[PDB]
Amino acid sequence: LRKSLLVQTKRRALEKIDLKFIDTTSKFGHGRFQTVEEKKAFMGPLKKD
Amino acid sequence: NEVVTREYTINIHKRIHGVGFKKRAPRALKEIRKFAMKEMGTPDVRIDTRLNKAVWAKGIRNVPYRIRVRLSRKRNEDEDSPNKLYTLVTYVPVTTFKNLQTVNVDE
């Protein structure tokens, strides 16, 4: 990584960034759960107990 | 210490993923030989006939996913080979495959 040589004066470059959501679903295929706790509540009980 | 024998399990799907259909079974016997030279230090490896039947029991294309095998380093008491020690490798019939580790058996 490196700081930019140019002098950035644009409304695109100087726009403040505020995040609202992080997508942490499994990238090892077509995942559908953000976390294990959200999964296990929707998954319910399993056979492996 | 040098004539020890023990159990091993070999996942074929790890060692053949990528090769063509007509070379899956011949590569598997070469990978069992390669696997036998890593644990047992003998470069000379003999594959017993029933193990060759077990790999070829499902055709050349559909090689079994998992196999449980017995490696036994032996004495080589008869031949004046340049190698003083060899390994005899034989197949062990196993029904269920989950939760079996490489246990050290006693001869």
């Binding site: 990584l1 409304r11 695109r12 726009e15 403040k16 960034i17 505020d18 995040l19 609202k20 959501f21 992080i22 997508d23 942490t24 990238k27 | -």
Partner: protein
């Protein structure tokens, strides 16, 4: 790796004003440095030696 960001874009004059988007980003794990030395440079007519 890479993932999504759902964020609020507040740029003026756009059609996406006051609406949300999804946005592909790249996750770069950036461990802290250990400084183990310094080096000096002098400008020459043949270069920067």
């Amino acid at each position: 790796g890479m993932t999504h960001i759902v964020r609020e874009v507040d740029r003026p004059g756009s059609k996406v004003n006051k609406k949300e988007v999804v946005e592909a980003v790249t996750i770069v794990e950036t461990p802290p440095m250990v400084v183990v030395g310094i080096v000096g440079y002098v400008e020459t007519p043949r270069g920067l030696r």
